[PDB]
Amino acid sequence: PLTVGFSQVGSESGWRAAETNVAKSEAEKRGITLKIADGQQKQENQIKAVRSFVAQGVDAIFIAPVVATGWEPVLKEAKDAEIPVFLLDRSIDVKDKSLYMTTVTADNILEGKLIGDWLVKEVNGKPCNVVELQGTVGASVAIDRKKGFAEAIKNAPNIKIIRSQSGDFTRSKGKEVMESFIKAENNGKNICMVYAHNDDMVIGAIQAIKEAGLKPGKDILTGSIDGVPDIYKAMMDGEANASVELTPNMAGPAFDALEKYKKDGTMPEKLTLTKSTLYLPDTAKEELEKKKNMGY
Numbered sequence: 001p002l003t004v005g006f007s008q009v010g011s012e013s014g015w016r017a018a019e020t021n022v023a024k025s026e027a028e029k030r031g032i033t034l035k036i037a038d039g040q041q042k043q044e045n046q047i048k049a050v051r052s053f054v055a056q057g058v059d060a061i062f063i064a065p066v067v068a069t070g071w072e073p074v075l076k077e078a079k080d081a082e083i084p085v086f087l088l089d090r091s092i093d094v095k096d097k098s099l100y101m102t103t104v105t106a107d108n109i110l111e112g113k114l115i116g117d118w119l120v121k122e123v124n125g126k127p128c129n130v131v132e133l134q135g136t137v138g139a140s141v142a143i144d145r146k147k148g149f150a151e152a153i154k155n156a157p158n159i160k161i162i163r164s165q166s167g168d169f170t171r172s173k174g175k176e177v178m179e180s181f182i183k184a185e186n187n188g189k190n191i192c193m194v195y196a197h198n199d200d201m202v203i204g205a206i207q208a209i210k211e212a213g214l215k216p217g218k219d220i221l222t223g224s225i226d227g228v229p230d231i232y233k234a235m236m237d238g239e240a241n242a243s244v245e246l247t248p249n250m251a252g253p254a255f256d257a258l259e260k261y262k263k264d265g266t267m268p269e270k271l272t273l274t275k276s277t278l279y280l281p282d283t284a285k286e287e288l289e290k291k292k293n294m295g296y
């Protein structure tokens with residue numbers, strides 16, 4: 001029997017809730033005992049959880065690292081204990097890449113690029129002021145999604161990012177920050193598009209846009225990432241424009257790699273990429289139907 005300790009970031013978004021659900025169902029069908037620690041969005045809580053898993057002598061540790069920095073000490077402890085570590089859905093910045101087995105993740109630069117490329121085509125040379133709702137400060141995915149979008153719009157100077165602040169990857173903070181952007185930009189009239197690093201923040205933004213008396217999806221376009229059910233519902237109501245799907249099944253490939261490793265010492269590739277796909281309202285109904293069956 002295998003026991004895996006998973007240090008989870010928390011439950012800040014519908015996507016992460018689905019990731020947790022899928023981690024559980026994946027573990028269950030594989031006969032793996034999965035212990036999930038909830039970090040409540042704090043790195044030090046995650047480090048404490050990892051230390052507990054090491055002390056307990058679990059067979060493997062999964063970590064969704066809330067931010068990219070500060071993991072060397074605890075990863076050295078896990079390595080000294082000979083407990084393999086698998087990173088899910090965010091990445092870390094360490095010199096010693098042998099401190100973990102693999103990172104299962106999307107290409108988050110690509111995710112940002114997909115939204116940026118879409119926007120360039122959508123506005124077709126016309127002026128477009130963008131407001132950006134970033135993810136958690138220091139999260140690899142926020143850094144990368146910012147970069148991908150920025151690079152995609154570079155040759156379209158008609159597009160300008162005029163506001164950018166973290167919305168903590170939550171609906172509530174996304175709404176709060178969007179409200180501040182709207183008030184700072186002529187009741188939202190000087191805003192063409194909101195780019196949110198996740199769907200949840202943009203769903204909060206959609207509320208703020210409506211409450212300001214504007215039409216989300218028309219007066220202010222939306223581009224975001226995850227493909228949570230509620231973004232497709234928003235698309236079907238005409239209130240959201242573009243979203244990049246992110247599989248909630250980050251745990252599956254990690255379990256695959258773990259099982260192979262425990263069976264005969266087969267090491268995984270250092271980067272295990274999941275597939276990213278842009279979805280627009282024309283496929284929203286079909287994608288929404290695929291979702292209650294994807295962990296949501």
Ligand SMILES: OC[C@@H](O)[C@@H]1O[C@@H](O)C(O)[C@H]1O
Binds near residue numbers: 012106199225246
């Ligand atoms: O890999 C994705 C990731 O780490 C992000 O965390 C969640 O907040 C969320 O919705 C999201 O896209």
